[PDB]
Design a protein around this ligand. Structure first.
Ligand code: ZLG
Length: 153
């Protein structure tokens, strides 16, 4: 079985600023709070990033492949292909879109994933685990880019 879900986040910063952060396949640690470091050899499709998680977690690293980087429509797609975690066949897509909330331009982020349900867990538990982490990441992306936006004011 799999869990497939989509999360949406409203960000009070312009798309060009949010995308400048999200597009850095080589620098996820700039807003993903559970990631420490990241190294990419050679940002083209097929690029492989080796990700160091923060110390004190059950896993320590992830290996992920760049499946999509569309700089015109603002789509980033990745797939996890290794590491000392339990997540199997994880892939995700995030896209950014301009929107106007309260008369001010902002950015809508849409992030979708598909992942296997491990044999020892329920599908509900798998969805909850992944959705909570992505929500954490999207909340942090909003915090980071809204802060950059304020610092530019
Ligand atoms: O943000 C991150 C960073 C990131 C990446 C990883 C592992 C290396 C993939 C981890 N992790 C995972 C683990 C060990 N548990 C699992 O494997 C795991 C797998 C299936 C599970 C199913 C369940 F029912 C309950 C618990 C489960 N537990 N130890 N550390 C973390 C820790 C939990 C906070 C954070 N990753 C994502 C991103 O968008 O980059 C967003 C979340 C989804 C992956 C992509």
């Amino acid at each position: 079985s799999q869990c497939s879900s989509t999360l949406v986040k409203h960000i009070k910063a312009p798309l060009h600023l949010v995308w400048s952060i999200v597009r850095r396949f080589d620098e996820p640690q700039k807003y993903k709070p559970f990631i420490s470091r990241c190294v990419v050899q050679g940002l083209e499709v097929g690029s492989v990033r080796e990700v160091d998680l923060k110390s004190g977690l059950p896993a320590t690293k992830s290996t992920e492949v760049l499946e999509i980087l569309d700089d015109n429509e603002h789509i980033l797609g990745i797939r996890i292909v290794g590491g000392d975690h339990r997540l199997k066949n994880y892939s995700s897509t995030i896209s950014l879109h301009s929107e106007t909330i309260d008369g001010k331009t902002g950015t809508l982020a849409i992030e979708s994933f598909v992942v296997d349900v491990p044999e020892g867990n329920t599908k509900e538990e798998t969805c909850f685990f992944v959705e909570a982490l992505i929500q954490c990441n999207l909340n942090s992306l909003a915090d980071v880019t809204e802060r950059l936006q304020a610092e530019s004011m």
